[PDB]
């Protein structure tokens, strides 16, 4: 009954949320304990681990805040299939391979996906990948898998890259599949998801009341007449709205697909699919930039502060 | 009713590249105006606020 007191005194304390500040010039111990957050990294010493508290269970606590650590999904890829000059924050799209026991993976950035679709944006695609044939056999039968319009249920978005070690023959990437996208380096710095500007469109800008707490990034494969395209939507609504909103936005191209060809078949009838990619702050995100290569540059959409959270593929019609 | 004269500086100011600025100028070619205040501001007592 007193052992329970000493135990419940340790299991009691929630983090002190409010605090009576007196003067901002004071910077006393209470406000430092409010602003201090423990790191996921320290040097391998006894004092550094025992002060950073790396061995704490569940979270990192020196010796439940709305903060959870992320989860990494590491893939091993053919090093020719992934141009290593790409930045940290680019959304990768792992193709579910038809090989039964293959331990090698086939990820795609959307730039590498563009030369897969078609076979400035095209200039940076062909400068980043001089070879449209070593990716045309990663998918073994692209013409069949698109001509029966089942390409959307084979591509699993795995969120953005965070760290990529450049090995020579078989490349190892570390992505973030779910949660808060943040770097793991010895100086920690911010990671920003970069999507190409010509591919990225907006949805509040296309429509031109309330402000939400977060906006959700959407990816959208769609089967047109001239091949598939990977547009990237950003929306601040909910999903069940966005299905009807993109049905309105594609209601031109739905009539165009029924018009320029008549679907005598039955597997052609789907018109793309959309999958949520996660939430970011709806206020100051997607500040544009340009991704500078050795000789050229494409304009890029640099979404800061991503919470990666993949959803599944829902058809559009 | 205007006054006829104002006091003012007679000579131009003197910005001469001293030794450490010259070393930066020789190595990288980038000179800091008043490098001495950089040394007093981020080496000896950087915590003193502006």
């Amino acid at each position: 009954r007193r052992r329970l007191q000493r135990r419940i005194a340790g299991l009691l304390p929630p983090p002190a949320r409010r605090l009576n500040i007196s003067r901002g010039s004071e910077f006393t111990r209470d406000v430092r304990g409010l602003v201090e957050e423990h790191a996921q990294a320290s040097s391998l010493s006894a004092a550094a681990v025992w002060r950073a508290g790396l061995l704490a269970p569940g979270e990192v606590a020196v010796a439940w805040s709305g903060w959870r650590p992320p989860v990494f999904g590491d893939f091993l890829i053919h090093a020719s299939s992934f141009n290593n000059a790409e930045a940290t924050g680019t959304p990768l799209f792992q193709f579910k391979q038809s090989d039964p026991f293959s331990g090698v993976d086939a990820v795609f950035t959307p730039l590498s996906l563009f030369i897969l679709m078609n076979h400035g944006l095209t200039r940076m695609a062909n400068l980043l990948y001089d070879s449209p044939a070593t990716l045309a056999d990663l998918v073994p039968d692209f013409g069949r898998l698109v001509a029966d319009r089942r390409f959307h249920n084979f591509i699993t978005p795995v969120g953005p890259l965070v760290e990529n070690i450049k090995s020579t023959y078989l490349n190892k990437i570390t992505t973030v599949v779910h949660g808060p996208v943040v770097s793991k380096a010895i100086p920690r710095s911010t990671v920003k998801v970069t999507v190409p500007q010509e591919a990225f469109v907006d949805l509040d800008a296309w429509l031109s009341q309330p402000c939400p707490a977060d906006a959700r990034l959407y990816v959208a494969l769609t089967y047109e007449e001239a091949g598939p395209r990977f547009t990237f939507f950003q929306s601040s609504r909910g999903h069940c709205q966005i299905m009807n909103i993109l049905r309105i936005y594609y209601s031109p191209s739905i009539m165009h697909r029924y018009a320029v060809v008549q679907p005598l078949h039955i597997e052609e009838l789907t018109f793309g699919a959309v999958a949520c990619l996660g939430t970011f702050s709806a206020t100051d995100g997607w500040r544009r930039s340009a991704f500078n290569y050795r000789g050229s540059s494409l304009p890029v959409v640099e979404i800061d502060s991503f919470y990666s959270n993949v959803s599944d593929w829902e058809v559009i019609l | 009713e205007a006054d006829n004269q104002i006091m003012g500086p007679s000579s131009y100011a003197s910005f001469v590249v001293r030794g450490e600025n010259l070393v930066t100028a020789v190595s990288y070619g980038r000179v800091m105006r008043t490098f001495e205040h950089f040394m007093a501001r981020i080496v000896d007592s950087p915590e003193k606020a502006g």
Binding site: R17, R18, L19, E37, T190, A213, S281, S305 | -
Partner: protein, 50 residues
């Protein structure tokens, strides 16, 4: 441009940006000044909203 049988009367509204004076008397209100509270609100992925 012939006149119909009706005659409309237009109503508009006009916005006039003034620069107002403001008087207030001595000791008009008594004010109960509280205390400042600081608190975080939403610890997102890289920034904690104080």
């Amino acid at each position: 441009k012939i006149h119909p049988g009706v005659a409309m009367t237009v109503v508009r509204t006009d916005e006039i940006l003034s620069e107002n004076i403001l008087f207030s008397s001595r000791a008009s209100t008594s004010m109960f000044i509280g205390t400042p509270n600081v608190s975080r609100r939403e610890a997102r992925v890289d920034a904690v909203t104080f």
